[PDB]
Amino acid sequence: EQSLPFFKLFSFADKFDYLLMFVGSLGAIVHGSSMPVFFLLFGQMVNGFGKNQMDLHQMVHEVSRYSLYFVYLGLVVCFSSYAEIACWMYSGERQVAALRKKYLEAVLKQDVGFFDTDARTGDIVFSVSTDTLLVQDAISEKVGNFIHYLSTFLAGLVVGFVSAWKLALLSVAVIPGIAFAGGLYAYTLTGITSKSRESYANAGVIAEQAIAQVRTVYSYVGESKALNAYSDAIQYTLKLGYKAGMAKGLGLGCTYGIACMSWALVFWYAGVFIRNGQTDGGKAFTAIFSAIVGGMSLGQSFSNLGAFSKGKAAGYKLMEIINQRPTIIQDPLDGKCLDQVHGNIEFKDVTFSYPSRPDVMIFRNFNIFFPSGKTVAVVGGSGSGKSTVVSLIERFYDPNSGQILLDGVEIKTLQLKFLREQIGLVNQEPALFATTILENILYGKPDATMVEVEAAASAANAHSFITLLPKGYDTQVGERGVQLSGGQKQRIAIARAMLKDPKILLLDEATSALDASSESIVQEALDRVMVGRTTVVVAHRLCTIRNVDSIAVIQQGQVVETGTHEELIAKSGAYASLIRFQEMVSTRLSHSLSTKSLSLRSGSLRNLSYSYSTGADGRIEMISNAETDRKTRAPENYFYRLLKLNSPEWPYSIMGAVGSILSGFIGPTFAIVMSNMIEVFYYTDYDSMERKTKEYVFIYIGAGLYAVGAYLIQHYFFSIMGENLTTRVRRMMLSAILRNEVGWFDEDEHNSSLIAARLATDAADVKSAIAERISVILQNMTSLLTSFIVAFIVEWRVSLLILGTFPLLVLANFAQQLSLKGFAGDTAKAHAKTSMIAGEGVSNIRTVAAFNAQSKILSLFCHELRVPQKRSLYRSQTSGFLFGLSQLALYGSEALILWYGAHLVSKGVSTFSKVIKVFVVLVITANSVAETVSLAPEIIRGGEAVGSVFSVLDRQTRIDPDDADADPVETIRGDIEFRHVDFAYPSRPDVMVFRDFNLRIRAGHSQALVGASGSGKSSVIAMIERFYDPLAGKVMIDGKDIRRLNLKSLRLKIGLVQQEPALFAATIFDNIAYGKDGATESEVIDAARAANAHGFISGLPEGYKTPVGERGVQLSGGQKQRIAIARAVLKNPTVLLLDEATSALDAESECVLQEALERLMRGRTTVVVAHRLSTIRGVDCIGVIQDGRIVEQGSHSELVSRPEGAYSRLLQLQTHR
Ligand SMILES: CC(C)[C@H](C)[C@@H](O)[C@H](O)[C@@H](C)[C@H]1CC[C@H]2[C@@H]3COC(=O)[C@H]4C[C@H](O)[C@H](O)C[C@]4(C)[C@H]3CC[C@]12C
């Protein structure tokens, strides 16, 4: 939407952060203008190094002096790279840790009705969690990289032009010839990747329907031809992935062919400007190098502007809640405070609707009255706003038309520390904050004593169960060490509402846990506190309502009838039907936040975002998302396994490993030709400096064509090898997902949106683990290897001191590559315990608003942000100092090589152009050896988070769909029998609805297992075919054990009809032929005319063909059911399995099954399940299931001849319309 300016992000800065930024921006400039000053000190050295070739005593003076200037330079990079990291990492924290402390003083004071779950309480939690890490990343340390590399651009054009100005206008005019083709590569490379994401979305729904509809894919045995349609929609992404590698070889070959055809330019006119008597070799070495690293260093300053715009986007979403003004606030001076309350709450002509949406009407002309010291029961028959009255006495909402008065005093003239203090609240699923179980009791009263805490939990059935825990009333209720994790939480929350002693006592519908004898223990606990209190009882079910002494019932906007439970039960006026209605009878945020986290982290790395889960039943768990270090490593023998899978392509690596050694030879060849022209620049024969600088230019032309035909080989090959590996893995993963049991798909983190992404991204970076980490190892170990053979043949007494100095040159060139991406490191991990305290004080705000606990959540927040600051005080003084010390050894150890270089020449041993060739080669080599030691952990350390796709390859399924040691099935006659069998759902193993079930179904008959009010009715058809396994006992079919038979040989003559039918993304000719392999045209027309939709299939535009899955014509719920019954009649099964539940038919003028009851049940053994007692006339037998057993069985002529049984209770439900 909108955005702030870049300033006003620096508006929480106190009078101490205007001092850490003044110092911290003199560190960023003096460290900036010290690489173009290095090119002036090293430039003036060579003037004295080789000018003085005839006087070997002036050499020792003018190199011993300029070597001392490197140590004086290294001590100004020592104390100025320390002052841009120890003053921007720490002063970017004290400004953002005062943004968190005022954003939470804003969302504790807004009106409580601002949060009604409508992507609102799932948005304030996300804004405090991630949007305060984007304002931190924008102002903390990437401002130091914006000043650093900009000042090199402004001081690379001042050292350059002052030395020799006719060479700082050639070298500047080169850079738009390199950056032209250096960005045309980066344009066309994106122009093919976007043709790959579009070429994959054809197969992004084929591996999406085959998992979300897995019950149908296993029922009709067609889990093989979801692999002959997924394989051929990857072959059009492989072939598009080949010419996205050729456009990487011709995008790096035409950059070393413009770079190495441009050093020949600036080194030719240096050979002219010296022959005219204008410059020398130390004023043409300064002008060229200072104006290129000055010109190349704008590509790093403008890399920070991507992060300075998210900090203006996320900066405005925070700064429109901090300065938002709410209505219902506390007036400490313009607000009264009474005494000796009585509690006669009265609603006097109040009308109200929700201010989120004023469409519906809730309390149109509403009038109820509350006595003093009595109980009422405000109850509706439906959602008539019966749960709204507790949200209005608390003044969570003002009544927009009406008045509410306490003892003849309107509540709009009282302060919100005296009104909310007198009312207690006990609600749905009572909120306990993840602290000790002693501090939760002290929310109802902050400080009285210890002995009243024990007396409060005494008369609440709580004094014992918090002593049967092996500590002194102290248990971390979030960290599930010793769990009071029953469905009956031992209700300490009722003990909160007793210690507070509220006069008005709002109770709520706190019987919503499938009540039993456990919920009757807390029932008398509520019955013993309700004395002398003006209390209400809001109830949803009238089972425990039997002793309430003045009940009032509302239906629509007002109360219908009042009185005690002698005259309310009388007269049958709108109460007898409601008690008849009694006789006829979170985890949403974490799924919502992860979808907001999905497709929003494509640029933010794994050190800044989170990954939201459900955790325990205390908090909302926030994983720091830097779990790639110490969570779920790969198998240790993976790198040999991923080479065994990728070995029919051996001739595409031998053509690439003898094509990646040839690119290691552009490392010495750049540094030998360039370090021979410093020699040539100091001749004194001006027609032998000419015909030797012609040879050193034709090599630059002849090595800008060697770099074209040695990157087309390195990157085209090793992309034939890298795309026949992310094609064989994706086919070996779908063929191993579609083999498991059905219960693995039932789990929440294995749904069909976290499993079609593991085939799109997590299996697409096996290319970047065994093909992009052998190319940059064979290259970098033949550039390290042939530049330590040149350096020893030329001169070996200097290149043995560099070899002892070489761990220090490769360390200083390694710390200059961590600094490009910040030294902060995993900044979402320290601010994780802090964020959950803001996370639990937003979603539990209806318990923070009562008890006046809006200052103790803030004092668990300012007392705890002290730890992630003193973590970021030691990390910013160590990382700032060790970076400022490793740079002292880069400049301070080139002073030792060059001084010892002038100790061997002056004693007659060496010469010039043998000390420089040893120096130039072994420093440019050390710049790319510290790239090999940067990808060195990620090979050993478990690969990475995408090299661990072996959980889907190596996972032994509980049910094996095919065997060799199992006899197949020839012909089923139908002998369905359940022996002594119990069963539980493996998703939630506490559900135990099956207890020793038994049936016996004879061939050529039917079965009519009734609904019985949803007592686990939809699991008999989930065991005739093995979608699950029983816990004990045998399932007998056709006289044989079912776990001894070939599963694919059995399912091709047992066909179900789905509860909720959905179709595949194809025509209506495949979706009616998917259930029969081989038949084409003859019996497909007539089987379409069985759930006769023939005018529906003749009246259709393109004959039979029409898209019905997606992006075509849309069908109704009554017409999609007609398609699924056309499948089963073409398959012609032996055991039919119908399923009807939760009134999902919805087909008025019912003729889709009036035809199908008598046509599809001719010789088929059917098992019908339906909750409706209509169109269920099983002509053979009928049964009733209760508690995992049958209670009554037989045909429908002896079940009705018996007087009651249990079927007569179901017979009442026909008149219960
Ligand atoms: C005086 C130098 C020899 C100095 C000691 C040396 O440390 C220097 O800082 C090195 C690391 C730099 C100076 C100039 C740089 C080059 C200047 O920019 C270029 O022309 C590019 C072209 C291309 O991008 C190459 O891959 C790197 C290459 C060719 C750069 C590679 C590294 C350098 C050669």
Tab-separated table of C-alpha atoms and ligand atoms in Angstrom, residues 35 38-39 42 178 255-256 259-260 263 285 289 292-293 296 670 674 813 894 919-920 923-924 927, ligand 1:
chain	number	residue	atom	x	y	z
A	35	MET	CA	41.908	0.139	-0.819
A	38	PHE	CA	46.863	0.748	-1.122
A	39	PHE	CA	47.161	1.195	-4.893
A	42	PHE	CA	52.130	-0.142	-3.802
A	178	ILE	CA	31.668	-4.877	-19.393
A	255	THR	CA	32.516	-11.603	-19.970
A	256	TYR	CA	36.085	-12.894	-19.806
A	259	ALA	CA	37.415	-8.155	-19.786
A	260	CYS	CA	40.495	-9.742	-21.373
A	263	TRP	CA	43.066	-4.920	-20.401
A	285	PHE	CA	49.664	1.196	-12.242
A	289	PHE	CA	43.623	-0.131	-10.701
A	292	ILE	CA	38.305	-0.052	-11.700
A	293	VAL	CA	37.863	-1.118	-8.075
A	296	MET	CA	33.188	-1.970	-9.813
A	670	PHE	CA	45.955	-13.478	-16.216
A	674	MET	CA	49.936	-8.739	-16.299
A	813	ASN	CA	40.486	-12.852	1.855
A	894	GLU	CA	52.881	-8.133	2.266
A	919	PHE	CA	54.146	-11.851	-5.557
A	920	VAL	CA	51.366	-11.229	-8.098
A	923	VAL	CA	48.093	-13.281	-4.048
A	924	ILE	CA	45.592	-13.640	-6.886
A	927	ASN	CA	41.720	-14.901	-3.559
B	1	LIG	C1	48.057	-5.090	-7.414
B	1	LIG	C2	47.230	-6.363	-7.403
B	1	LIG	C3	47.995	-7.481	-8.090
B	1	LIG	C4	46.812	-6.759	-5.978
B	1	LIG	C5	48.018	-7.255	-5.164
B	1	LIG	C6	45.644	-7.736	-5.924
B	1	LIG	O1	45.518	-8.239	-4.582
B	1	LIG	C7	44.272	-7.247	-6.430
B	1	LIG	O2	43.549	-6.603	-5.374
B	1	LIG	C8	43.356	-8.292	-7.093
B	1	LIG	C9	42.769	-9.241	-6.047
B	1	LIG	C10	42.271	-7.649	-7.981
B	1	LIG	C11	42.703	-6.272	-8.549
B	1	LIG	C12	41.878	-6.048	-9.822
B	1	LIG	C13	40.941	-7.255	-9.876
B	1	LIG	C14	40.355	-7.612	-11.238
B	1	LIG	C15	39.761	-6.324	-11.765
B	1	LIG	O3	38.520	-6.536	-12.464
B	1	LIG	C16	38.545	-7.251	-13.591
B	1	LIG	O4	38.911	-6.836	-14.655
B	1	LIG	C17	38.015	-8.635	-13.339
B	1	LIG	C18	37.602	-9.338	-14.632
B	1	LIG	C19	36.844	-10.579	-14.222
B	1	LIG	O5	35.684	-10.211	-13.467
B	1	LIG	C20	37.731	-11.524	-13.428
B	1	LIG	O6	36.975	-12.656	-12.992
B	1	LIG	C21	38.342	-10.840	-12.222
B	1	LIG	C22	39.005	-9.482	-12.498
B	1	LIG	C23	40.283	-9.737	-13.310
B	1	LIG	C24	39.393	-8.808	-11.150
B	1	LIG	C25	39.992	-9.911	-10.273
B	1	LIG	C26	40.804	-9.564	-9.033
B	1	LIG	C27	41.759	-8.398	-9.249
B	1	LIG	C28	42.944	-8.811	-10.125
